Amino acid sequence: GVQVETISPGDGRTFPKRGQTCVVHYTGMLEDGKKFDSSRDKNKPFKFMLGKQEVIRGWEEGVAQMSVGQRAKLTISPDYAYGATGVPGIIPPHATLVFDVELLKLE
Amino acid sequence: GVQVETISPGDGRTFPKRGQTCVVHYTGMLEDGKKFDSSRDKNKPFKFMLGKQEVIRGWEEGVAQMSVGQRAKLTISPDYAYGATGVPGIIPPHATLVFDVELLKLE
Ligand SMILES: C=CC[C@@H]1/C=C(\C)C[C@H](C)C[C@H](OC)[C@H]2O[C@@](O)(C(=O)C(=O)N3CCCC[C@H]3C(=O)O[C@H](/C(C)=C/[C@@H]3CC[C@@H](O)[C@H](OC)C3)[C@H](C)[C@@H](O)CC1=O)[C@H](C)C[C@@H]2OC
């Protein structure tokens, strides 16, 4: 349920392992380009861990395919995101989400 | 994405309208009967409003089909619940959810 298109290559060597912390920058957009979120505009990187059901599965599977330093467009199917519910006031029902993600570091 | 089976009939007259508050009792179970939640065991009824993207869509569409006093089994497809992500530590990925719901009042 995720398509990964690469904007800038990573090192081709260091990929996220289950239970590491990934530090990324991302902007989330709707399929017409409409931004709904951006880590950059709160300055910070976002950090999460793989394999703990803590981010939507499409993110998890998309970022697992990236190596460090890679910049990629993740297009996530609704059932690998917020499905038929969406997120109140932010994501409609049945929405495909596009995230521009940069994998900065694994900790 | 929801199937509604009736355990006890409601009044056949008073159905939830968009923007009313529904007061219910529910227990949520996995498809093998495993309970994961119950309003009754925290005593209280659960209250929510229709049409505000505030509960999973399958709940919303299931309860909209019930009249006051009805007791029903709602079986909800993953994409109308927590999809491929689940809820960490509570709902697996791709889970069909079964809720036993009693619609007590509309406010
Ligand atoms: C107080 C609250 C606690 C904590 C909240 C914050 C730090 C809140 C802060 C405003 C910004 C959020 O995040 C930085 C914000 O990010 C979005 O803007 C977004 O871009 C998003 O989609 N993200 C974030 C980047 C990773 C992918 C995805 C994610 O997976 O996000 C996760 C998420 C929502 C996952 C659920 C978890 C349960 C599953 O049942 C469900 O599965 C259906 C998927 C986030 C990281 C959660 O782990 C963290 C929490 O919830 C959402 C559109 C709305 C979401 O606000 C909620």
Ligand SMILES: C=CC[C@@H]1/C=C(\C)C[C@H](C)C[C@H](OC)[C@H]2O[C@@](O)(C(=O)C(=O)N3CCCC[C@H]3C(=O)O[C@H](/C(C)=C/[C@@H]3CC[C@@H](O)[C@H](OC)C3)[C@H](C)[C@@H](O)CC1=O)[C@H](C)C[C@@H]2OC
């Ligand atoms: C602090 C937090 C604030 C607030 C939390 C509480 C009162 C927390 C308390 C422990 C018990 C929760 O609820 C009483 C509990 O209920 C479950 O046990 C459950 O049985 C459930 O599935 N429910 C509840 C009854 C209606 C259907 C469904 C629901 O829709 O629930 C809603 C929900 C999770 C919807 C999201 C909303 C965003 C969408 O993006 C997403 O779509 C993918 C679906 C609930 C009611 C939210 O509106 C309310 C909040 O989140 C979940 C298995 C886990 C969930 O804890 C989170």
